[PDB]
């Protein structure tokens, strides 16, 4: 399978500029073998959270060839587990071997491939390392929830983000959770006896400021606390629901960069081999 | 060595069709033969039955 996004007539002063797009991904809506350029298109920058919400319902595809007539592509992941392709870094950060890649909408805007001939423009989304897109998305959703090099939020769909966050956070509260909460003093006194434990707890940990302000009595034994046990259930819920927390907020990883012969790192704006996962 | 190996396991696995036919013959001839004891009188009283 290969997607054929047909192109209208374009300006020779701009067709050539669009030929410089060989490793940027685009977001279709359905996977029919043929399609049109007028279809895969987004307006200029705005509402980064709206954009990242848009990048989850529509599976993406990477382009490979740009001839003056057609433009091939490849559905990113629909059945492939090792389908090796190429895509170029278009983010501000570099990327080393091995690490997974994530797709996040373009920040600050102003990166729009304007096509005055077809009157339509695109926004090829950037590619970041995983662990850093995590920080980016976390910062954006925290600042959006604050509303009861920075774009202004919208307060319209930010409530979707706040809701999706607060739901997963609330469903962490189980009758066993308070049993784990009844040791904050017992934890802190352990933190100050070993260097590693003290390094684990951060500085603005927002709980270290609780261990010295409030006291809690022994926790009341729950109902039928003589057959089952709530600590293990609580922790299983925690791990199962945290292993995917960032996914339902940010974007799932889609590919990991592999390089067999080339230099270890790829600087920004250079093609890099990759395997999709 | 690898070729001798093939030739040998070849000549080792599939003629167990010959042995296997020899087996199936008995396995079928057994499940349809009544014992002579229950059959020697059965032919003697034949005709006058029912």
């Amino acid at each position: 399978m290969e997607v054929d996004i047909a192109l209208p007539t374009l300006s020779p002063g701009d067709l050539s500029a669009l030929q410089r797009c060989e490793g940027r991904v685009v977001f279709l809506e359905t996977l029919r073998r043929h399609a049109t350029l007028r279809e895969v298109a987004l307006p200029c920058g705005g509402d980064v959270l709206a954009a990242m919400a848009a990048y989850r319902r529509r599976f993406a595809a990477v382009i490979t060839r740009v001839t003056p007539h057609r433009m091939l592509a490849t559905p990113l992941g629909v059945g492939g587990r090792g389908q090796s392709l190429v895509l170029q870094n278009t983010g501000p950060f570099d990327l080393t071997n091995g690490d997974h890649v994530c797709l996040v909408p373009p920040l600050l805007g102003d990166e729009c491939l304007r096509l005055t001939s077809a009157n339509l423009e695109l926004r090829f989304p950037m590619t970041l390392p995983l662990a850093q897109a995590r920080e980016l998305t976390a910062r954006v959703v925290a600042r959006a929830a604050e509303t009861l090099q920075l774009p202004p939020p919208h307060r319209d769909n930010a409530e979707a983000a706040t809701r999706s966050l607060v739901l997963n956070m609330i469903f962490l509260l189980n009758e066993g959770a308070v049993i784990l909460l009844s040791l904050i003093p017992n934890l802190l006194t352990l933190g100050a006896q070993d260097g590693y434990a003290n390094a684990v707890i951060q500085l603005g940990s927002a709980t270290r400021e609780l261990g010295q302000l409030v006291r809690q009595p022994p926790p009341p034994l729950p109902q039928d606390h003589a057959r089952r046990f709530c600590v293990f259930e609580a922790l299983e819920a925690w791990i199962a629901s945290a292993s995917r927390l960032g996914d339902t907020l940010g974007t799932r990883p889609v590919a990991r960069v592999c390089i067999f012969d080339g230099p270890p790192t790829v600087p920004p704006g250079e093609k890099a081999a990759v395997v999709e996962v | 060595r690898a070729i001798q190996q093939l030739a040998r396991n070849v000549q080792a696995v599939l003629d167990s069709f010959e042995r296997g036919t020899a087996d199936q013959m008995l396995r079928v001839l057994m499940e349809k033969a009544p014992p002579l004891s229950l059959l020697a009188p059965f032919t003697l009283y034949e005709g006058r039955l029912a």
Partner: peptide, 23 residues
Amino acid sequence: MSVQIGNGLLMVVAPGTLTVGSA
């Protein structure tokens, strides 16, 4: 009595390269 239908198999596994690259 030893040569090429498993030495058959053996050489011309050859005319199979796509095993396509597409999902």
